[PDB]
Design an enzyme around this catalytic site. Structure first.
Site, short mmCIF file in Angstrom:
data_model
loop_
_atom_site.label_atom_id
_atom_site.label_comp_id
_atom_site.label_asym_id
_atom_site.label_seq_id
_atom_site.Cartn_x
_atom_site.Cartn_y
_atom_site.Cartn_z
N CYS A 109 34.53 32.34 -11.90
CA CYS A 109 33.11 32.16 -11.62
C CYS A 109 32.34 32.09 -12.93
O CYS A 109 32.37 33.03 -13.73
CB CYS A 109 32.56 33.31 -10.75
N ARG A 112 28.61 34.59 -13.68
CA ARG A 112 28.69 36.04 -13.61
C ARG A 112 27.69 36.77 -14.50
O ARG A 112 27.63 38.00 -14.44
CB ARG A 112 30.10 36.52 -13.95
N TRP A 281 23.42 30.30 -6.22
CA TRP A 281 22.78 28.99 -6.28
C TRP A 281 23.74 28.02 -6.97
O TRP A 281 24.68 28.43 -7.64
CB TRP A 281 21.44 29.03 -7.02
N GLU A 286 28.71 20.85 -9.16
CA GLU A 286 29.40 21.10 -7.90
C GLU A 286 29.04 20.04 -6.86
O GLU A 286 29.92 19.54 -6.15
CB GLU A 286 29.06 22.49 -7.36
C1 HEM Z 1 24.20 32.81 -8.71
C2 HEM Z 1 24.73 31.74 -9.30
C3 HEM Z 1 26.24 31.38 -9.24
C4 HEM Z 1 26.76 30.30 -9.81
C5 HEM Z 1 26.00 29.22 -10.64
C6 HEM Z 1 28.17 30.29 -9.53
C7 HEM Z 1 29.05 29.33 -9.96
C8 HEM Z 1 30.36 29.19 -9.59
C9 HEM Z 1 31.15 27.99 -9.75
C10 HEM Z 1 30.63 26.67 -10.35
C11 HEM Z 1 32.38 28.25 -9.30
C12 HEM Z 1 33.53 27.25 -9.23
C13 HEM Z 1 33.46 26.90 -7.75
C14 HEM Z 1 34.11 25.60 -7.37
O1 HEM Z 1 34.40 24.78 -8.27
O2 HEM Z 1 34.32 25.44 -6.14
C15 HEM Z 1 32.41 29.62 -8.80
C16 HEM Z 1 33.48 30.31 -8.26
C17 HEM Z 1 33.40 31.58 -7.70
N1 HEM Z 1 32.23 32.33 -7.54
FE1 HEM Z 1 30.43 32.08 -8.51
N2 HEM Z 1 28.51 31.40 -8.79
C18 HEM Z 1 27.33 32.10 -8.57
C19 HEM Z 1 27.24 33.27 -7.83
C20 HEM Z 1 28.29 33.96 -7.26
C21 HEM Z 1 28.17 35.18 -6.46
C22 HEM Z 1 26.81 35.84 -6.08
C23 HEM Z 1 29.42 35.54 -6.09
C24 HEM Z 1 29.87 36.75 -5.25
C25 HEM Z 1 29.08 37.81 -5.06
C26 HEM Z 1 30.35 34.58 -6.67
C27 HEM Z 1 31.73 34.58 -6.57
C28 HEM Z 1 32.57 33.54 -6.93
C29 HEM Z 1 34.00 33.54 -6.71
C30 HEM Z 1 34.79 34.70 -6.06
C31 HEM Z 1 34.49 32.37 -7.17
C32 HEM Z 1 35.98 31.98 -7.17
C33 HEM Z 1 36.60 32.97 -8.17
C34 HEM Z 1 38.07 33.29 -8.10
O3 HEM Z 1 38.80 32.84 -7.16
O4 HEM Z 1 38.49 34.04 -9.04
N3 HEM Z 1 29.62 33.65 -7.35
N4 HEM Z 1 31.16 30.15 -9.02
C1 LIG Z 2 28.61 32.09 -4.68
C2 LIG Z 2 28.93 30.72 -5.21
C3 LIG Z 2 27.95 29.95 -5.82
C4 LIG Z 2 28.29 28.69 -6.30
N1 LIG Z 2 27.33 27.92 -6.90
N2 LIG Z 2 29.56 28.21 -6.16
C5 LIG Z 2 30.52 28.95 -5.56
C6 LIG Z 2 31.82 28.46 -5.41
C7 LIG Z 2 32.81 29.23 -4.81
C8 LIG Z 2 34.19 28.69 -4.62
C9 LIG Z 2 34.30 27.54 -3.83
C10 LIG Z 2 35.53 26.96 -3.56
C11 LIG Z 2 36.68 27.55 -4.07
O1 LIG Z 2 37.90 26.97 -3.80
C12 LIG Z 2 38.69 27.38 -2.68
C13 LIG Z 2 39.94 26.52 -2.62
C14 LIG Z 2 40.73 26.70 -3.90
C15 LIG Z 2 41.84 27.38 -3.12
C16 LIG Z 2 41.06 27.17 -1.83
C17 LIG Z 2 36.57 28.70 -4.84
C18 LIG Z 2 37.82 29.33 -5.40
N3 LIG Z 2 37.82 30.78 -5.25
C19 LIG Z 2 35.34 29.29 -5.10
C20 LIG Z 2 32.50 30.50 -4.35
C21 LIG Z 2 31.20 30.99 -4.48
C22 LIG Z 2 30.22 30.22 -5.08
#
Ligand code: HEM
Ligand SMILES: Cc1cc(N)nc2cc(-c3ccc(OCC4CCC4)c(CN)c3)ccc12
Ligand code: HEM
Ligand SMILES: Cc1cc(N)nc2cc(-c3ccc(OCC4CCC4)c(CN)c3)ccc12
Ligand SMILES: C[C@H](O)[C@H](O)[C@H]1CNc2nc(N)[nH]c(=O)c2N1
Ligand SMILES: C[C@H](O)[C@H](O)[C@H]1CNc2nc(N)[nH]c(=O)c2N1
Ligand SMILES: [Zn+2]
Lengths: 410, 411
Positions: A109, A112, A281, A286
């Site tokens: 993420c 963070r 957000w 994305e």
């Molecule tokens: C507030 C602004 C936030 C932004 C800009 C952001 C951004 C991102 C982005 C760009 C990704 C890659 C997702 C993808 O390519 O599908 C990601 C993954 C992720 N986000 Fe964040 N996120 C935010 C907030 C949060 C919050 C509030 C949570 C949980 C409370 C969270 C938990 C996660 C998790 C669990 C992943 C995948 C991580 C893993 O599997 O290790 N995010 N995020």
């Molecule tokens: C809170 C939040 C904000 C944001 N802006 N973006 C976010 C993107 C993800 C997220 C989306 C798709 C994902 O991929 C799942 C496939 C890979 C294996 C199944 C993962 C990977 N954990 C994270 C999770 C939370 C997000």
């Protein structure tokens, strides 16, 4: 084994000691790196108590009461409750801390830096899918906040014996439907074709449009899931236009403002929360890079390049790259114009570098997955490209879990 | 034990068995992944198993495993080791080894070409002047008037580590960099330390923005010596843009031949510390990294200025817009001058086809996703969506310390 990470643009070197606290496994070995692999019956009484102890230890260290009366008392109380009930319940204080730290530990993420400003909605008193629907509408409205988005998680009751799981069947609270066409093409979002059909093949009546907000499929206490439509006035959407190309409007693109991931599992002190939707957000890429330009998604590059009158005969004209930038300019422009929170990939990666340096200084490290942190366009002109990162698994954590239709005793 | 990788854009699943022949370590453990870390005197004791392993692979590849030729060669190498403490490769073995080091280079996206490699045997070389001659001939052969040809020149192997052959340049052709007293840099900032060494060794620096560096060549452990590559052997391309006529007035050019000269080639436990190799450029190497890295020529600002983009907020994506234009200009200029180059779309698609072929014929293809994915437009290339397995096979190209940090000066 007190490892160093170098930034090759700035020569800043950080020493990581936090990884020595890592507990779970990465999937790599000394003979093979699995860093690019996407995805590398309940806890028994013996397994659960050490997990609780490790969590409570770090919780009471975080409030400067390690080795205190209240600390030892809580360890005893939980230890008694595990011996007695074969599980235990988190205090509200421990639940909030565990959720914030699960986000803090999410190595994929980039967002963070915000981790400590998470709004935690305790829904452990929920008992039905209608109740789940109510909690989720309240989450959506709270997080959307008329376009001034706020981070939030809603935590439903923890797994007991795995027969009584709470699950949100959608992958995100808000996504667009996907329909396979008679001829062979796909209308709407191809990533959601299977779910769109489990909705239809379960009751839903689909507008069969290009951007149909999917219904919620909510499962309480292990029962069959139920369909609910989110009130349209709670789903904030942004029509996509370009600040230079008047014809961009005619493409007919929109996207939703609230990214709310709903299919992951939150693990705190050994307890498992199978239904814990969380939202923040969007980073612009994305939507603009992945949702719109992936060939397995809306795949609009061809159509946009044609409207730009680019030479699409040879790949070396970089017409794909040129269109890609314009699409992403338009996404940011549209969200910004409608006062919906969004961040571009330059701002977000710059923030993550500052967060890394904060975490190295005040915590001794920050687990980070370079493959996921580097944005999917313009990689090397963002600072995270040149930043070495160590990836490891800390708990509390968000984990993946199987899609429930492959698991559900129907 | 078998391992699967999935392409998430096509759902093609491949099975890796080749990783079982991996011996060297990755840097990772079950508890930490070091996949983004840039960088994660040998006795007769360990050498014969390394030789035997290589020779077994070599004779298998030629369908002669267990033959009398195979067994005689093993015997011969064994006795050459115990009596001389080292051994010499046959020419056939050297060519095989060099090709397979390229085949095994997990950070290289260009490996579909691995079997078309021109191997120049320079193991009879004895002096720096001899090295200069071999390198000039490599440059002329590889350049081929713009129709680039892959090549490698292999100088004598390490003996006691006190008589190494080394090319002190990191690449055969590179531009100088000069730190100015006002803190700014003229030329290529990546080459400041090396430029200062050359100047100290007696190079007269033109002190311009694109000065081709001299060769600094070390034979047999002696102090290195300076040589100027004949300018007529150094093919360069002036960079212009197909729509933007002001782009030529930025004064940019680049050289056509990418020739990495600071790595070590390991074959059968033997170590070739001087083994320059060259191919042809992928456009982003120049247009993204060499030009637009903040620590390199860093031309994004001036390009965006002349394009008159909104440069006040990063969310205009003015940096991304300028970056595409610069990379269009690089590709256009090389093609217009008929100098071999490949764009990142073509090269990544070729690599996917190469990789699948390697899984079928070889049981695997070690690949480093962090390096294979291009530094712009990542997810619109097919390698972004491809799961990859990274592991270490020999023969191999390895990093080695810069010679000025280890050399003992004769004076
Ligand atoms: C507030 C602004 C936030 C932004 C800009 C952001 C951004 C991102 C982005 C760009 C990704 C890659 C997702 C993808 O390519 O599908 C990601 C993954 C992720 N986000 Fe964040 N996120 C935010 C907030 C949060 C919050 C509030 C949570 C949980 C409370 C969270 C938990 C996660 C998790 C669990 C992943 C995948 C991580 C893993 O599997 O290790 N995010 N995020
Ligand atoms: C809170 C939040 C904000 C944001 N802006 N973006 C976010 C993107 C993800 C997220 C989306 C798709 C994902 O991929 C799942 C496939 C890979 C294996 C199944 C993962 C990977 N954990 C994270 C999770 C939370 C997000
Ligand atoms: C023929 C066209 C070739 C192309 C287009 C190509 C492309 C590339 C690129 C883009 C990289 C990443 C390096 C960077 O970003 O600085 C790379 C790495 C590399 N290339 Fe190639 N290359 C080619 C030929 C060769 C040849 C002929 C050799 C050796 C015989 C070679 C060996 C390597 C090695 C050893 C690396 C580093 C790999 C590692 O550490 O695992 N390449 N190549
Ligand atoms: C024949 C050829 C052609 C081409 N078009 N490009 C090439 C790029 C490399 C290469 C360039 C820079 C590198 O980076 C050095 C850093 C790692 C430690 C410092 C590496 C490293 N593996 C390989 C090697 C050969 C290439
Ligand atoms: C195969 C590869 O791991 C896969 O394409 C990954 C690469 N990096 C990613 N990075 C982000 N942020 N999101 C993704 O979905 C992916 N996909
Ligand atoms: C920190 C990170 O590993 C480093 O910047 C890497 C990332 N990927 C790369 N990929 C290529 N092709 N070339 C590089 O120099 C790098 N640098
Ligand atoms: Zn790894």
């Amino acid at each position: 084994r007190f490892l160093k990470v170098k930034n090759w643009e700035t020569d800043v070197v950080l020493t990581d000691t936090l990884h020595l606290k890592s507990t779970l496994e990465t999937g790599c070995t000394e003979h093979i790196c699995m860093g690019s692999i996407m995805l590398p019956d309940v806890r028994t009484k013996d397994q659960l108590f050490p997990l609780a102890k490790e969590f409570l230890d770090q919780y009471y260290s975080s409030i400067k009461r390690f080795g205190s009366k209240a600390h030892m008392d809580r360890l005893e109380e939980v230890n008694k409750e595990i011996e007695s009930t074969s599980t235990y319940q988190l205090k509200d204080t421990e639940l909030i801390y565990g959720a914030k730290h699960a986000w803090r530990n999410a190595s994929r993420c980039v967002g963070r830096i915000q981790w400590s400003k998470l709004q935690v909605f305790d829904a452990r008193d929920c008992t039905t899918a209608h109740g789940m629907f109510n909690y989720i509408c309240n989450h959506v409205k709270y997080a959307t906040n008329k376009g001034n988005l706020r981070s939030a998680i809603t935590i439903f009751p923890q797994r007991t014996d795995g027969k009584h799981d709470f699950r949100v069947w959608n992958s995100q609270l808000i996504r667009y439907a996907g329909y396979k066409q008679p001829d062979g093409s796909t209308l709407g979002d191809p990533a959601n074709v299977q779910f769109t059909e489990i909705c239809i093949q379960q009751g839903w009546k689909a507008p069969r449009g290009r951007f149909d907000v999917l219904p919620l499929l909510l499962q309480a206490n292990g029962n069959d899931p139920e369909l609910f439509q989110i009130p349209p006035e709670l789903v904030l959407e942004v029509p996509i236009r370009h600040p230079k190309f008047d014809w961009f409007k005619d493409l007919g693109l929109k996207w939703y403002g609230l990214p709310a991931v709903s299919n992951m599992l939150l693990e705190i002190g050994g307890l498992e929360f199978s239904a814990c939707p969380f939202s923040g957000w969007y980073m612009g890429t994305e939507i603009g890079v992945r949702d719109y330009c992936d060939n397995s998604r809306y795949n609009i590059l061809e159509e946009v390049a044609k409207k730009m009158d680019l030479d699409m005969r040879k790949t070396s004209s970089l017409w794909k790259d040129q269109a890609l930038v314009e699409i992403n300019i338009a996404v940011l422009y549209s969200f910004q114009s409608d006062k919906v929170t969004i961040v571009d990939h330059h701002s977000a990666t710059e923030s993550f570098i500052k967060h890394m340096e904060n975490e190295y200084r005040c915590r001794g490290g920050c687990p980070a997955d370079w493959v996921w942190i580097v944005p999917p366009m313009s990689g090397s002109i963002t600072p995270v490209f040149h930043q070495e990162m160590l990836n490891y698994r800390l708990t509390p954590s968000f984990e993946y879990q199987p899609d429930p239709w492959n698991t559900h005793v129907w």
